[PDB]
């Protein structure tokens, strides 16, 4: 009840976040700065009643079981939201972020066409990496929107939690939220190969059964998208190899050499304008030479390939991104240099 | 009703029916989805239809797990395997057809050498390729020919059952994983005490199953197994490279002795826009290839295949695409888009 | 009675009250125990007093476990945290004071540069030293200044709560381990979905907490954390040397990028015999230090600090002891006793 009015005020004011906590009125983030609403301060009873008013009994029992809860929900004709609810100093608290219904396109994010071209493969493993809140969901949503528009294939999503809704355009899209639609990632992966899928967005690679699921899916003729937490292609490769036991790293390396179609390592940086974030990206797309370097156990030489893979594979170094951000004046020169993983390379350029 | 949906699916030769909310029913024909001229279904529709083919205990199970596998029949039409799940708080369903009638070898476009392989007394024969590339169809053709011509013992273990074989002249026992046997491991642990001649093992999912199949192949039994590669070399590399480096010599020796045929398939759309056509690579070891195995020269086995056309009946993918091009079954672009080396296929043209 | 014991404890500015059999009550003042002029308590005394501040359920818990943590208030005086336990078959108790008033930066003897650090928008700041060396007091001063001057989001996670912050202009949510959240791991797994600007993570107990703090530090958030070293070099060596050798270069780059301040404190007794005084080492990276990180020369960063007094506001421990000696706050022997290089301090004198 009150939550609906509070959220209406949030939308009407162009706000990003709603905060519910004891002994303070609700506060909304406007242009980066917090502003309290003209309401009495909340107590533990208030945050409790507001947060419980939009949850089912299963969600309530989960939260009461863990004193933590991640969730998403929509208000029809208004907007969708991603929420995180927690407990502090013995009282209920809630935070709610706005997740737009309309997905921005690839060109709006400033990503070159080769990233879009890697997304147009029939099968294999494509990884988009970077830390949390680095734009991963936005690229993934643009992709699964392009695929929904352009292909006649079966897209299934497993999400923790569901973030973007994809109404049916020409594909059939089934989206499973862990903790509501399905018991766990393990159960979904146990049954997804008998629901005739072609494309899968799997979320975080939280355990071995899911990594194994990604290799089997990519090997059984599907296009698998997954996320990681790393800042560069080489660091990404090291991450991929090093998670497996040492005796089993050879097979996974062979598998990866077969199924890998693209690795993207992104990062969102604050914009100089004070609104939005700007992309710095290292892109590795395997060619026959890189696949041989993997097969030949010459893992060092990948650095040489990124230095020499601009024309062949479209691999763009960090310094070229700093050049472009500097010419358009979106970021300053010092932070860009301060962010380069190898300033001596930037010096050489 | 559901009977009408499945009859339309059957009549149009579709493999899979997809039922989900806010979209009309969609069916996969030749790999591509097509919606039926009906209003979109809602959660009530999918729920009522899927529950209409569930027992009360199966409905209890499904509501307990949000997953359910089952099979059912439509009289005078066909049987169907259904999978029901939940997405966005609503019922969803996928239904896969199980054909009763196996097409013959010549109907599948397979050369006569496969028929001579059905008369082989022992060894290991591999049918590989991505999902829906005709592997199961090839096995069903082999099983039906063997069942008809020989008086031997066929045992199949499948997860799930794809083709049913009433007894014709052999005794055929078919075990379903998750009901008939706990796992591949228990069936393979006990299969050698069932007086077998022919064994179907399902997917080569791990090392244990490979070891069971290798033992079968050396002691005079016929074992069929699958992989998930697109070429002969990828198959050989996958099997060898899964073992530690110190044990690969023995495995290479085993493979050199027991291998009698390797089939890797791919299903391509037809130029007419209706139906799909089989492209298949066949590797039959000759002394040169067996030496290449002993010499650790896997990158050169393809070269022996380049010259094994007249002697062993081999045929590269480019040669098959060439024949499909001369017969105008596929376009040049699709063949090049699938050629692992488009320049070789260009040169042979 | 107990009320009198806690009021005398507060009035004398003590930190802890110790109650155990066959000794009078003893209070820690400036780190040293003083017994009160009362007869020694027996096991009946400690039992009755500790049980007098326990609920019946809490008495059941304590009798079940021989351990009990709790907090309670004495009206018009102070709040207290109690721990009750058992030794030689008898009740024992320890009682801590949790002050409501935070002293200011100037009252703590901290130079003005710390105030400018409370205005920093991002980076990683470390407050280190042994237990009770002023680390928590420094954090409370920082949080109070930030709460007063900024409109941002502060989240603290503590085991246990040390300072309570009513909302002043920020929203501050404080999570108690063992009640509000199961562990550091769950809070850090979910903290990035609460729209934070400022996060307090407690002790850097393991690798996973370091990884959470490093991710926070590079994505634009303010993270404060602690360690347990007595100098800047020991802090850098402890953070870098925890990772395997192959991952230490990237980590060194991360630290070189996100670090904005390192605070290593130590509390010394005063020459007057009443009160304690803060000695603090401040490391703010300059280009020379960042290069030293890049060049794997940790043993030479101290030398850069030896020459960074005028430029960056740095100050060695010996220089602080020198100032305290000039101000006659401490004796020469104590300073030499705490100097990591007494010869250097003598030389600068």
Residue with tokens 């879009």: A116
Q: Known binder of ligand: residue A48?
A: no
Residue in A197, A174, A194, A178 with CA at minimum distance from that of residue A186? A178
Q: B242 CB near a chain A CB, below 8 Å?
A: yes
**Per-residue DSSP letters for A20-74?**
E-TTS--EEEETTEEEE-SSPPP-HHHHHHHHHTT--HHHHHHHHHHS-EEEEEE
Residue of C nearest to A98 (CA): C195
Q: Is beta strand C26-29 parallel, antiparallel or unpaired with respect to C16-19?
A: antiparallel
Chain B closest-CA separation from residue A154 CA (Å): 8
With CB atoms and an 8 Å threshold, state whether C175 touches A88: yes
Q: Count of CB contacts below 8 A, A vs C?
A: 85
Residue in C244, C235, C147, C155 with CA at minimum distance from that of residue C200? C155
Q: Known binder of ligand: residue A135?
A: yes
CB within 8 Å of A28: residues ≥ 6 apart: A9, A10, A13, A15, A16, A17, A18, A19, A34, A35, A36, A37
* SS3 call for A144: helix
Residue in B113, B50, B126, B111 with CA at minimum distance from that of residue B84? B50
Residue list, annotated binding site of C for Mg(2+): 136, 162
- For chain A, the farthest-separated pair of C-alpha atoms sits apart, in whole angstroms, at 68
Q: Could you check whether the bond before residue C222 is cis, i.e. omega within 30 degrees of 0?
A: no
With CB atoms and an 8 Å threshold, state whether C215 touches A16: no
CB within 8 Å of A158: residues ≥ 6 apart: A176, A178, A182, A185, A188, A189, A192, A200, A201, A202, A203
Q: A275 CB near a chain C CB, below 8 Å?
A: no
Measured in degrees and rounded to the nearest 5, phi and psi for residue C323 equal -65, -40
Compute how many other C-beta atoms are within 10 angstroms of the C-beta atom of residue C63.
Answer: 12
Structure token pair of residue C200: 């307090």
Chains A and C touch (3+ CB pairs under 8 A): yes
User: Are the beta carbons of C256 and C232 closer than 8 angstroms?
Assistant: no
**Per-residue DSSP letters for C152-194?**
-EEEEEESS-------SSSEEEEEEBTTTBS-HHHHHHHGGGS
Distances (CA, A) of A158 to A181, A229, C208: 9, 18, 26
Q: Count of CB contacts below 8 A, A vs B?
A: 95
In terms of residues, how long is chain A? 349
Contacts of A238 in chain C (CB under 8 A): 246
Residue in B16, B337, B17, B129 with CA at minimum distance from that of residue A120? B337
Half-sphere exposure of C33 (CA within 13 A, CB side): 9
| CA A188 from centroid of its chain's CA atoms | 20
Using only the alpha carbons of chain B, give its radius of gyration: 22
Q: Known binder of ligand: residue A82?
A: yes
Q: B136 CB near a chain A CB, below 8 Å?
A: no
Residue in B215, B187, B218 with CA at minimum distance from that of residue B201? B187
With CB atoms and an 8 Å threshold, state whether A84 touches C171: no
CA distance C304 to C320: 17
Residue in B286, B241, B293 with CA at minimum distance from that of residue B261? B286
Give CA torsion, residues C99, C103, C105, C106, to 10 deg. -150
Measured in degrees and rounded to the nearest 5, phi and psi for residue B77 equal -120, -75
User: Are the beta carbons of C217 and A131 closer than 8 angstroms?
Assistant: no
Subunits with 3+ Cβ pairs within 8 Å of A are: B, C
Contacts of B131 in chain A (CB under 8 A): 220-222
Is the CA virtual torsion C203, C208, C213, C214 positive or negative?
A: positive
HEC string for A179-242: CCCECCHHHHHHHHHHCCCCEEEEEECCCHHHHHHHHHHHHCCCEEEEEECCCCHHHHHHHHHH
Half-sphere exposure of C214 (CA within 13 A, CB side): 20
The pairs formed by C143-151 with CB atoms below 8 angstroms and a separation of 24 or more are: C143/C172, C143/C198, C143/C200, C144/C102, C144/C168, C145/C105, C145/C115, C145/C118, C146/C118, C146/C170, C146/C198, C147/C172, C149/C118, C149/C119, C150/C197, C151/A33, C151/A34, C151/A35
CA distance C303 to C301: 5
* SS3 call for A329: coil
Q: A291 CB near a chain B CB, below 8 Å?
A: no
Half-sphere exposure of A48 (CA within 13 A, CB side): 8
| CA A71 from centroid of its chain's CA atoms | 16
HEC string for C96-151: EECCCCCCCCCCCCCCCHHHHHCCCCCEEEEEECCCCCCHHHHHHHHHHHHHHHCC
Give CA torsion, residues C101, C105, C108, C109, to 10 deg. -160
Strands in A79-88's sheet, in edge-to-edge order, are A33-36, A27-30, A17-20, A91-99, A79-88, A69-75
Q: A41 CB near a chain C CB, below 8 Å?
A: yes
HEC string for B34-66: EECCCCCCCHHHHHHHHHCCCCHHHHHHHHHHC
Measured in degrees and rounded to the nearest 5, phi and psi for residue C3 equal -60, -40
**Per-residue DSSP letters for B159-208?**
SS-------SSSEEEEEEBTTTBS-HHHHHHHGGGS--SEEEEEE--SHH
CA distance C295 to C305: 17
* SS3 call for A311: helix
Residue in C13, C154, C115, C153 with CA at minimum distance from that of residue C163? C154
Helical H runs in chain B? 2-11, 43-51, 56-65, 105-108, 113-117, 135-149, 184-190, 207-218, 232-241, 248-258, 287-294, 301-306, 309-312, 317-326, 332-338, 342-348
Query: Buried b vs exposed e over C82-97: b needs ≥16 C-beta within 10 Å?
Result: bebbbeeebbbbbbbb
Contacts of B26 in chain A (CB under 8 A): 172
Q: At what angle do helices A249-259 and A233-242 cross, to 10 degrees?
A: 130
CA distance A223 to A261: 9
Q: Known binder of ligand: residue A246?
A: no
Using only the alpha carbons of chain C, give its radius of gyration: 22
Residue of B nearest to A162 (CA): B88
| CA A95 from centroid of its chain's CA atoms | 19
Chains C and B touch (3+ CB pairs under 8 A): no
Q: Known binder of ligand: residue A138?
A: yes
Residue in B34, B25, B29 with CA at minimum distance from that of residue B4? B25
With CB atoms and an 8 Å threshold, state whether A172 touches B23: yes
CB within 8 Å of B186: residues ≥ 6 apart: none
With CB atoms and an 8 Å threshold, state whether C173 touches A21: yes
With CB atoms and an 8 Å threshold, state whether C193 touches A95: yes
Half-sphere exposure of A1 (CA within 13 A, CB side): 2
Residue in B290, B275, B282 with CA at minimum distance from that of residue B317? B282
Interface test with A, best of C98, C147, C151, C294 (most A CBs within 10 A): C151
User: Are the beta carbons of C223 and C87 closer than 8 angstroms?
Assistant: no
With CB atoms and an 8 Å threshold, state whether A220 touches B133: no
- The structure's method of determination equals cryo-EM
* SS3 call for A308: helix
CA distance B188 to B204: 12
Interface test with B, best of A191, A222, A255, A296 (most B CBs within 10 A): A191
Q: A233 CB near a chain C CB, below 8 Å?
A: no
DSSP bridge pairs for C68: C84
| Closest Cβ opposite residue A168 in set B23, B65, B242 | B23
The pairs formed by C177-182 with CB atoms below 8 angstroms and a separation of 24 or more are: C177/C202, C179/A67, C179/A90, C180/A67, C180/A86, C180/A87, C180/A88, C180/A89, C180/A90, C181/A67, C181/A68, C181/A86, C181/A87, C181/C157, C182/A66, C182/A67
CA distance B87 to C310: 64
User: Are the beta carbons of C280 and C105 closer than 8 angstroms?
Assistant: no
Q: C152 CB near a chain A CB, below 8 Å?
A: yes
With CB atoms and an 8 Å threshold, state whether A24 touches C167: yes
CA distance A221 to B267: 11
Compute how many other C-beta atoms are within 10 angstroms of the C-beta atom of residue A20.
Answer: 24
CA distance B23 to C156: 47
Chain C closest-CA separation from residue A49 CA (Å): 18
Residue of B nearest to A195 (CA): B94
CB within 8 Å of A88: residues ≥ 6 apart: A21, A22, C173, C174, C175, C180
Q: At what angle do helices B248-258 and B207-218 cross, to 10 degrees?
A: 50
Q: Is beta strand B276-283 parallel, antiparallel or unpaired with respect to B67-74?
A: unpaired
CA distance C215 to A172: 36
Q: Is beta strand B153-158 parallel, antiparallel or unpaired with respect to B198-203?
A: parallel
Q: B274 CB near a chain A CB, below 8 Å?
A: no
Q: What is the DSSP letter of A178?
A: B
Residue with tokens 């969901």: A137
Distances (CA, A) of B105 to B119, B144, B323: 14, 10, 18
User: Are the beta carbons of C165 and C98 closer than 8 angstroms?
Assistant: no
CA distance A226 to A210: 10
User: Are the beta carbons of C102 and C144 closer than 8 angstroms?
Assistant: yes
Chain A closest-CA separation from residue B287 CA (Å): 27
State in Å, rounded, how far the first CA of chain C is from the last one: 52
Q: A181 CB near a chain C CB, below 8 Å?
A: no
Q: Could you check whether the bond before residue C160 is cis, i.e. omega within 30 degrees of 0?
A: yes
CA distance B252 to B240: 7
Subunits with 3+ Cβ pairs within 8 Å of B are: A
Structure token pair of residue B342: 């488009």
- Where do the domains of chain C lie, and which CATH numbers do they carry? 1-101 (3.30.450.90), 102-349 (3.40.50.300)
State in Å, rounded, how far the first CA of chain A is from the last one: 59
């Amino acid at each position: 009840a009150n939550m609906h009015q509070l959220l209406t005020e949030l939308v009407n004011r162009g706000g990003s976040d709603l905060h519910l906590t004891t002994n303070s009125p609700p506060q909304i983030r406007i242009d980066g700065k917090l502003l309290p609403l003209d309401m009495p301060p909340l107590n533990a009873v208030d945050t409790k009643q507001l947060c419980y008013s939009i949850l089912t009994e299963q969600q309530k029992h989960k939260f009461e079981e863990n004193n933590e809860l991640d969730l998403s929900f929509g208000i029809k004709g208004l907007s969708r939201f991603r929420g995180n609810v927690f407990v502090q100093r013995g009282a209920v608290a809630g935070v709610f972020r706005v997740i737009p219904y309309k997905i921005l396109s690839f060109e709006e994010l400033g990503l070159p066409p080769v990233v879009r071209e890697l997304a147009e493969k029939p099968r294999g493993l494509v990884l988009v990496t970077g830390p949390t809140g680095s734009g991963k969901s936005t690229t993934l949503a643009a992709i699964i929107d392009k695929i929904n528009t352009d292909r006649h294939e079966h897209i299934v999503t497993v999400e923790d939690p569901i973030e973007y809704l994809h109404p049916h355009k020409s594909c059939v899209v089934n989206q499973r939220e862990v903790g509501a639609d399905t018991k766990s990632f393990k159960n979904a992966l146990k049954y997804i190969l008998r629901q005739d899928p072609d494309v899968v967005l799997v979320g975080e690679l939280r355990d071995l059964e899911t990594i194994e699921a990604a290799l089997t899916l990519a090997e059984t003729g599907h296009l698998c998208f997954a996320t990681l937490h790393t800042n560069s292609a080489v660091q990404t490769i090291n991450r991929i190899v090093d998670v497996f036991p040492s005796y089993q790293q050879p097979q996974v390396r062979a598998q990866l050499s077969f199924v890998l179609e693209g690795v993207l390592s992104q990062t969102l940086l604050p914009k100089a304008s004070g609104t939005g974030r700007v992309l710095a990206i290292e892109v590795m797309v395997p060619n026959p030479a890189i696949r041989n370097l993997i097969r030949e156990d010459k893992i060092h030489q990948i650095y040489s390939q990124m230095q020499v893979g601009q024309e062949k594979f479209g691999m763009m170094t960090m310094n070229q991104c700093l050049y472009g951000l500097l010419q358009k004046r979106h970021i300053t020169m010092d932070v860009g240099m301060g962010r380069s993983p190898d300033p001596d390379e930037l010096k050489q350029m």
